[PDB]
UniProtKB/TrEMBL annotation, chains A, B:
Family in the record: Belongs to the myoviridae tail sheath protein family.
Species in which this protein is naturally found: Pseudomonas aeruginosa (strain ATCC 15692 / DSM 22644 / CIP 104116 / JCM 14847 / LMG 12228 / 1C / PRS 101 / PAO1)
Domain of life: Bacteria
Name under which the protein is recorded: Probable bacteriophage protein
Transmembrane segments annotated in the record for this chain: none
Length: 46, 46
């Protein structure tokens, strides 16, 4: 920790570390978005 | 047809083909163009 490890805190024995992380969230709702389009309809020409 | 087969024409079930041909016309007037020349008049020399 850059701010919490002050010279007054270090001189009392306190020394601080930060551990930031992200867990793996369980995919409780896998959503799917299906659509019928006409984008590749001109692909039937060759 | 590259133009008439669009993505919006094919989405309605329309698909276009072009059949361009040439009929064999009847020779109703064979024209003949007969002429006398002097190009082969110099052939009788050898």
């Amino acid at each position: 920790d850059p701010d919490l490890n002050s010279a007054s805190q270090l001189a009392q024995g306190k020394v601080y570390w930060n551990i930031r992380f992200t867990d793996v969230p369980p995919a409780e709702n896998p959503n799917f978005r299906v659509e019928v389009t006409d984008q590749w309809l001109t692909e039937v020409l060759d």
